[PDB]
Structure formats: C-alpha cells, structure tokens
Scaffold this active site. Structure first.
Site, PDB file in Angstrom:
ATOM      1  N   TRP A  79       1.280  32.996  32.459  1.00 48.20           N
ATOM      2  CA  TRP A  79       0.995  31.559  32.049  1.00 48.20           C
ATOM      3  C   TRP A  79       2.464  30.907  32.022  1.00 48.20           C
ATOM      4  O   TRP A  79       2.179  29.523  31.990  1.00 48.20           O
ATOM      5  CB  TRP A  79       0.731  31.681  30.440  1.00 48.20           C
ATOM      6  CG  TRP A  79      -0.669  32.490  30.217  1.00 48.20           C
ATOM      7  CD1 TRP A  79      -0.638  33.681  29.569  1.00 48.20           C
ATOM      8  CD2 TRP A  79      -1.987  31.951  30.306  1.00 48.20           C
ATOM      9  NE1 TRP A  79      -1.990  34.233  29.493  1.00 48.20           N
ATOM     10  CE2 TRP A  79      -2.802  33.141  29.751  1.00 48.20           C
ATOM     11  CE3 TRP A  79      -2.369  31.003  30.940  1.00 48.20           C
ATOM     12  CZ2 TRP A  79      -4.097  32.984  30.219  1.00 48.20           C
ATOM     13  CZ3 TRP A  79      -3.782  30.844  31.028  1.00 48.20           C
ATOM     14  CH2 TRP A  79      -4.615  31.944  30.346  1.00 48.20           C
ATOM     15  N   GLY A 113      -1.789  24.676  26.588  1.00 50.13           N
ATOM     16  CA  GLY A 113      -0.689  25.398  26.653  1.00 50.13           C
ATOM     17  C   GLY A 113       0.045  24.544  25.371  1.00 50.13           C
ATOM     18  O   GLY A 113       1.082  24.357  25.332  1.00 50.13           O
ATOM     19  N   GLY A 114      -0.618  24.316  24.341  1.00 46.38           N
ATOM     20  CA  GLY A 114      -0.389  23.650  23.033  1.00 46.38           C
ATOM     21  C   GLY A 114       0.414  22.493  23.248  1.00 46.38           C
ATOM     22  O   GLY A 114       1.106  22.061  22.302  1.00 46.38           O
ATOM     23  N   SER A 195      -8.064  25.056  25.446  1.00 45.86           N
ATOM     24  CA  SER A 195      -7.052  24.858  24.490  1.00 45.86           C
ATOM     25  C   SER A 195      -6.883  23.391  24.572  1.00 45.86           C
ATOM     26  O   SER A 195      -7.454  22.394  24.200  1.00 45.86           O
ATOM     27  CB  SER A 195      -5.896  25.749  24.910  1.00 45.86           C
ATOM     28  OG  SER A 195      -4.829  25.547  23.986  1.00 45.86           O
ATOM     29  N   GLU A 322     -10.378  34.613  19.373  1.00 43.73           N
ATOM     30  CA  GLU A 322      -9.409  33.407  19.647  1.00 43.73           C
ATOM     31  C   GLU A 322      -7.857  33.676  18.953  1.00 43.73           C
ATOM     32  O   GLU A 322      -6.948  33.161  19.463  1.00 43.73           O
ATOM     33  CB  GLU A 322      -9.865  32.220  19.202  1.00 43.73           C
ATOM     34  CG  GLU A 322     -11.127  31.845  19.849  1.00 43.73           C
ATOM     35  CD  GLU A 322     -10.638  31.044  21.203  1.00 43.73           C
ATOM     36  OE1 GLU A 322      -9.665  31.104  21.374  1.00 43.73           O
ATOM     37  OE2 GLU A 322     -11.767  30.480  21.911  1.00 43.73           O
ATOM     38  N   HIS A 435      -7.779  34.571  23.642  1.00 40.09           N
ATOM     39  CA  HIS A 435      -7.651  33.209  24.006  1.00 40.09           C
ATOM     40  C   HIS A 435      -7.069  33.106  25.260  1.00 40.09           C
ATOM     41  O   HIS A 435      -6.252  33.514  25.752  1.00 40.09           O
ATOM     42  CB  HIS A 435      -6.672  32.571  22.885  1.00 40.09           C
ATOM     43  CG  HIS A 435      -6.342  31.072  23.224  1.00 40.09           C
ATOM     44  ND1 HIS A 435      -7.076  30.111  22.658  1.00 40.09           N
ATOM     45  CD2 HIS A 435      -5.372  30.551  23.904  1.00 40.09           C
ATOM     46  CE1 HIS A 435      -6.714  28.987  23.075  1.00 40.09           C
ATOM     47  NE2 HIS A 435      -5.594  29.076  23.401  1.00 40.09           N
TER      48      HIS A 435
END
Ligand SMILES: *[C@@H]1O[C@H](CO[C@@H]2O[C@@H](C)[C@@H](O)[C@@H](O)[C@@H]2O)[C@@H](O[C@@H]2O[C@H](CO)[C@@H](O)[C@H](O)[C@H]2NC(C)=O)[C@H](O)[C@H]1NC(C)=O
Ligand SMILES: *[C@@H]1O[C@H](CO[C@@H]2O[C@@H](C)[C@@H](O)[C@@H](O)[C@@H]2O)[C@@H](O[C@@H]2O[C@H](CO)[C@@H](O)[C@H](O)[C@H]2NC(C)=O)[C@H](O)[C@H]1NC(C)=O
Ligand SMILES: CCCCN[C@@H](Cc1c[nH]c2ccccc12)C(=O)NCC[C@H]1CC[C@H](N(C)C)CC1
Ligand SMILES: *[C@@H]1O[C@H](CO[C@@H]2O[C@@H](C)[C@@H](O)[C@@H](O)[C@@H]2O)[C@@H](O)[C@H](O)[C@H]1NC(C)=O
Ligand SMILES: *[C@@H]1O[C@H](CO)[C@@H](O)[C@H](O)[C@H]1NC(C)=O
Ligand SMILES: *[C@@H]1O[C@H](CO)[C@@H](O)[C@H](O)[C@H]1NC(C)=O
Ligand SMILES: *[C@@H]1O[C@H](CO)[C@@H](O)[C@H](O)[C@H]1NC(C)=O
EC number: 3.1.1.8
Length: 526
Positions: A79, A113-114, A195, A322, A435
């Site tokens: 990621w 990625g928030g 996300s 999740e 997730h």
C-alpha cells in the site's frame, strides 16, 4: 500511439495482455503543479504545451507519511507509494483497448488511504486487465492528501479545504474534455473507489459541480456518512492551528499563517501532520473533507436526508472483516504474528483505543451489545468482537445506511458482501476478509494465471469484472451468460444483497441488522 489532446499531444506505450494489446498513457498532467504560492490552493488549469508529452511511466505520488509498522512485510508495504513523493503530483493515467475503441465506457478510479495516503500507481490499481478483458477505458488520478490536500481555514481562499477533492474533480473534467480523443464516451463515465476513495465518490454525488462529470457510481468499503469521513469545521480549524503552532507559524491574520506554512518544506508539514489529532486512533483522518461552502454546500448528512444528490444508479458493498486490519495498529494483545487471542480486559482496553473521546457509558454500551456470546467458552470471542466493532461502526453500517437513504429517492441500488479471503493474502488467517483486499479481484489480477491465484479465484474475479463492467455500461451489475445468480436491487424494505465468494453466490436480507441498529440509531446519542 500518439493522441492529440486539448493541451498538446501525448505519447503512450504498448502493453501485451492475455495475447492482446492495451495502450497505456501513464503520467498525463491535469493541472499546474501546486507549488510555491499555489500550495493549499485549488488546482489551477493547465496551460498549453507544444511538445509530445511522453506518458510512458507513472508520475510522482503526492507527499504523504508512510506506513512503517511492518518493515519488509508485503501486507503493509504493498500500500506504500511506489513512485517518488513530490508536491508536483497532479497527473493521471489512461488504459485504452487495442485497437482503439469507438465509444467505450469509462471507469474512473479514486484510490483510498484515509485521505492521508495513496497513489494511483499501486500494483493493485493496474487497469490494463479491465481494458483488455472488458473493452472499457480505465482512468485513475493522483490527488493531494494530508494537510497539503485538505488543510482548511473555511472561507479563506489561501486554504479553503477540499483541495484533494477538487484535484479529483479537475481530473473528471479532463476526462470530459479529452477522453473522446482516446475513443471513450464522455457520456458513460463510472466513478469507482475504495475506502476514502469510496467516500470521495459519494461526495461527488453530493457536490453540484461534479454532477455533469460522471454517469454512475461504485462505492467499495466507504461512504461520506462514515464517522471518519468528514472533518467538522471546529476540528478543521483546530488542527490547522495545531499545525501552525507545531511549526512556529502561529499568527492571527489567518492568511498570515498560510503564507508561513507555504515556506516550510513538505517534510516539516508531513512530520507534524501526525500529531494534530487530539484523540488519535488508527482510523483518524488528520486532514479530511470539510463543509467548505464550495465543494460541499451543507453538512452532507442533511443533503442525503433531504435527497439533494445526483439521481443515478449506485453499486455499494463491504467486506466481511473490515475492522481487523486496524486492530494490529494499536489494539493491545493483537499481532499479525500470532492468533491474537485477547481477554475481556484487553477488549475493554481496545475500545478505549478506538473510542477515546467517548463516554464511559458509551463504551459499556458497545461491550454490552457485542459480548453476548453463543459460547462463553470460545477463546476468540473477544478478538473477533473487537474486529466486528471496528468494522461495523466505521464501514459496514454507514455503507448500509447510505444505500437505504439513497435508494429511498427512487434510484436503483445494488449492495454486495465480499467474503472471499485471498489465497495469497500475506496477513494471518484470523484477520479474515480484510479491508482493501477485494480491490485486486475488481481489477482482474487473478485473471493472470501466472500469478499464484487458485482457479476458483480466476472465475470469481472474472464474474466480478463482468458485473462491474455491465454496471458501468448498462447500470445493471448482472452476469447474464453463465447462469449466474441475478443481483436484485436494494430496496428500503427488503434490503436484499448479493454475497461474492468462490463457493455459492446467494441473495440474503438485512445485513448486520441488529449491529447496525445499535450504531446508527442509538450510538449517535451518547
Ligand atoms: C485543539 O484541540 C485540543 C483538544 O481540546 C479538547 O478536546 C476537544 C474535543 C474539546 O473537548 C475541547 O473543549 C477540549 O479543550 C485543544 O486543547 C487540548 O486539549 C487536550 C485535552 O483536552 C489537552 O492536550 C490540553 O488540555 C489542551 N491543550 C492546550 C494547549 O490547552 C487544543 O489546544 C486545540 N488547539 C488549539 C486551541 O489551537
Ligand atoms: C501475541 O503477540 C502480542 C505482541 O507481542 C509482540 O509480538 C509477539 C509475536 C512477540 O514477538 C512478543 O515478544 C512481542 O512483544 C502479545 O502482546 C504482548 O504480550 C505480552 C505478555 O502478555 C505483554 O507484556 C506485551 O505488552 C504485549 N504487547 C502488546 C499488548 O502490545 C500477545 O500476548 C501475543 N498473544 C498470543 C496469544 O501469543
Ligand atoms: C493519530 C492520527 C493517526 C493517523 N491517521 C491514519 C491515516 C490513515 C491511513 N490509512 C487510513 C485508512 C482509513 C482511515 C485513516 C487512515 C493512520 O495513519 N492510521 C494508522 C496507519 C495504518 C495505515 C494503513 C491502514 N490500512 C492499510 C489497514 C491502517 C492504519
Ligand atoms: C519522448 O520519447 C521519444 C521517443 O522515445 C521512445 O520511447 C522511449 C520509451 C524510449 O525507449 C526511447 O528510446 C524511444 O526512442 C524521444 O525521442 C524524446 O526525446 C522524448 N521526449 C522527451 C522530452 O524526453
Ligand atoms: C457515443 O454514444 C453517445 C450516447 O451515449 C452518442 O451521443 C455519441 O454520438 C456516440 N459517439 C460516437 C458513436 O462516436
Ligand atoms: C492581513 O489581513 C487583512 C485583513 O484582516 C488582509 O487584507 C491582508 O491581506 C492580510 N495581510 C497580508 C500580508 O495579506
Ligand atoms: C463463462 O464460462 C466460460 C466457460 O464456459 C468462461 O470461459 C467465461 O470466462 C465465463 N464468463 C464469465 C463472464 O464469467
């Protein structure tokens, strides 16, 4: 292999995929690089070039802190950015089928990625398979994240907020003005994201300036009504000021502070980004979308409740586990290297990690609802209970609530429940269907028989790829040829959803009914 665009010509490259050809355009700029005076500002339009831009390699990823909790571990490092970090980072990629299509449906990916991390160049966002197998055009873009993308002084144009969302928006209009030259149909554009990218897609349904830039929407493990998704204007200015003090730019003209932050180096901003959050959790969005009066004209929960969004079809869904991914980033007694059997005291400590600013009564109500065991004797009771808590609260129940309230205004909605655990999954088995690990199946990576997936996974990814493409093309996510289960629409009453696995694909009703009545109806009160 050279296409003429409205700003200049671009050169692509050929790719050999499954005995066929895909033409890829990697690293097309879509804005003035947001450097110098342009930092924290909305993306500026791009001026002409007379060269032939060589779009043959992924461009820079935007500046971001990097996950270091597991050095050398592929489960976390897959990621992490795989190109250089740079403020000069507003670029996009295009995969088109070969030969050039005539009027192809376009799929626009928005990574997650928030809102703090992510890049379109990740291995699992490779759209060459979708272009090859389904004859669609795949587009993905880099957008600014963290403070550089979402720092906000509401009303102040030097830092208005939602800059990353406007980056996305500018990419959408690039596809509008240019994708015809690539053989795409600007009138059949489907956004899809996961996300924080799924939350971005839902916000594009709400922001009026994006209603003409796309046709349909796909929402994977995210929506704007998730509790991490929007920064309140209080939190927003409070974190902007914490950042200002933490780098010595504290001042009282508010443009004062932005000009001082403009001359600090990106690494100083990234260094102090981490600590602006008072009650920090692994799921905390340090700098996120705000109600800015421009992209977001009102509090989005009001707009959704009163039907103020683009009327179109949606495809929404979640994964089985999740919440597990986040438990090894702070919860005590948890580790990816053992089975993480925790005790009741460790469970109670975990809720304080994930609900730090919550009442003691609120924390007990969580434990009351989730610790009624079918088995007082199963040792993993508390381990899985904490995972379900984080998943239900942060992802599953907000996605279900968004789907009902969106479908209540008359549009077709389709909900899925992904429950297949990847055969190559590098994380331990106790974390389950994690997730972010449906993404590879959506992009068709198991279709590559070279790469260690089981044959059942090939057939599952092949069917998902057809459903997603049929949704983009036709608004109906069916697989009509191979005697597949028919995917019914999600209605407010019966709430039918489709489960996706290698075994039996089944229609079920009212996903997590009891858990979500706790989170959506009661918990917002404490
Ligand atoms: C940014 O916010 C923190 C947190 O404020 C507290 O938490 C809020 C959710 C709300 O309850 C406020 O009324 C609280 O004051 C500000 O203050 C710090 O708060 C924490 C815990 O309360 C703690 O570290 C200190 O007591 C506070 N620090 C200071 C220097 O007072 C913080 O100051 C805000 N940033 C600003 C005002 O620039
Ligand atoms: C599972 O592991 C966690 C994490 O401990 C670390 O990882 C292990 C694999 C091993 O390398 C340890 O040496 C590491 O410290 C364990 O949590 C720790 O447990 C001990 C004793 O209970 C405690 O002193 C530590 O504070 C814990 N660390 C925390 C809470 O972060 C856990 O006990 C292991 N569980 C099982 C069932 O093996
Ligand atoms: C106190 C402030 C903390 C910083 N805030 C967050 C930023 C963020 C990144 N990814 C998100 C996804 C959702 C929400 C938010 C974030 C943060 O770094 N979490 C801990 C780091 C890891 C990173 C990888 C994630 N998945 C791959 C499992 C799990 C968490
Ligand atoms: C753009 O690219 C032109 C041709 O490059 C060709 O393709 C790449 C992938 C290499 O393999 C190269 O050897 C090939 O000739 C260049 O002639 C041109 O200089 C490039 N433009 C710039 C600004 O670098
Ligand atoms: C592509 O399809 C649209 C309708 O979706 C149509 O209006 C347009 O003319 C077509 N363009 C072609 C076939 O080049
Ligand atoms: C200081 O604030 C005033 C308004 O209060 C603004 O007009 C001015 O531009 C700010 N200073 C600078 C150097 O921009
Ligand atoms: C349908 O089944 C055939 C095998 O008979 C398979 O090759 C093909 O990929 C399947 N198509 C889809 C869309 O799943």
């Amino acid at each position: 292999i050279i296409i003429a665009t409205k700003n200049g010509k671009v050169r692509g490259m050929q790719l050999t995929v499954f005995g066929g050809t895909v033409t890829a355009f990697l690293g097309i700029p879509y804005a003035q690089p947001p450097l110098g005076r342009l930092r924290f500002k909305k993306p500026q339009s791009l001026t002409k070039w007379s060269d032939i831009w060589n779009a043959t390699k992924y461009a820079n990823s935007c500046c971001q802190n990097i996950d270091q909790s597991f050095p050398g571990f592929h489960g976390s490092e897959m990621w992490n950015p795989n190109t250089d970090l740079s403020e000069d980072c507003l670029y996009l990629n295009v995969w088109i089928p070969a030969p050039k299509p005539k009027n192809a449906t376009v799929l626009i990916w928005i990574y997650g990625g928030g809102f703090q991390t992510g890049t379109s160049s990740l291995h699992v966002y490779d759209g060459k398979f979708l272009a090859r197998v389904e004859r669609v055009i795949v587009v993905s873009m880099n957008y600014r994240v963290g403070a550089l993308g979402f720092l906000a002084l509401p009303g102040n144009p030097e830092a208005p907020g939602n800059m990353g969302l406007f980056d996305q928006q500018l990419a959408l209009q690039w596809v509008q003005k240019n994708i015809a030259a690539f053989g795409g149909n600007p009138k059949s554009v489907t956004l899809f994201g996961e996300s924080a990218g799924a939350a971005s897609v839902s916000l594009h349904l709400l922001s009026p300036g994006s209603h003409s830039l796309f046709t349909r929407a796909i929402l994977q493990s995210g929506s704007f009504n998730a509790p991490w998704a929007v920064t309140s204007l209080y939190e927003a200015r409070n974190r902007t000021l914490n950042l200002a003090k933490l780098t010595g730019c504290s001042r009282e003209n508010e443009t004062e502070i932005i000009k001082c932050l403009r001359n600090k180096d990106p690494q100083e901003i990234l260094l102090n980004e981490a600590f602006v959050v008072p009650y920090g959790t692994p799921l905390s969005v340090n700098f996120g979308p705000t109600v800015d009066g421009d992209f977001l004209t009102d509090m989005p929960d009001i707009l959704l409740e009163l039907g103020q969004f683009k009327k179109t079809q949606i495809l929404v869904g979640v994964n089985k586990d999740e919440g597990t991914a986040f438990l090894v980033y702070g919860a005590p007694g948890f580790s990816k290297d053992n089975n993480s059997i925790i005790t009741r005291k460790e469970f109670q400590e975990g809720l304080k990690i994930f609900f730090p600013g919550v009442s003691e009564f609120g924390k007990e109500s969580i434990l009351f609802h989730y610790t009624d065991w079918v088995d007082d004797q199963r040792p993993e009771n508390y381990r899985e209970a904490l995972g379900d808590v984080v998943g239900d609260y942060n992802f599953i129940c907000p996605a279900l609530e968004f789907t009902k309230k969106f479908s209540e205004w008359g549009n077709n909605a389709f909900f899925y429940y992904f429950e297949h655990r990847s055969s190559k999954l590098p994380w331990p088995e106790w974390m389950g269907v994690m997730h972010g690990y449906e993404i590879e199946f959506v992009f068709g990576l198991p279709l590559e028989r070279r790469d260690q997936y089981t044959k059942a996974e090939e057939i599952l990814s092949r069917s998902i790829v057809k459903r997603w493409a049929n949704f983009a093309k036709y608004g109906n996510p069916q697989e009509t040829q191979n005697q597949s289960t028919s995917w019914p629409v999600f209605k407010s009453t019966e709430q039918k959803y489709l489960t996706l696995n290698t075994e039996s694909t089944r229609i079920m009703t009212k996903l997590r009914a009891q858990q979500c009545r706790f989170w959506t109806s009661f918990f917002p009160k404490v």
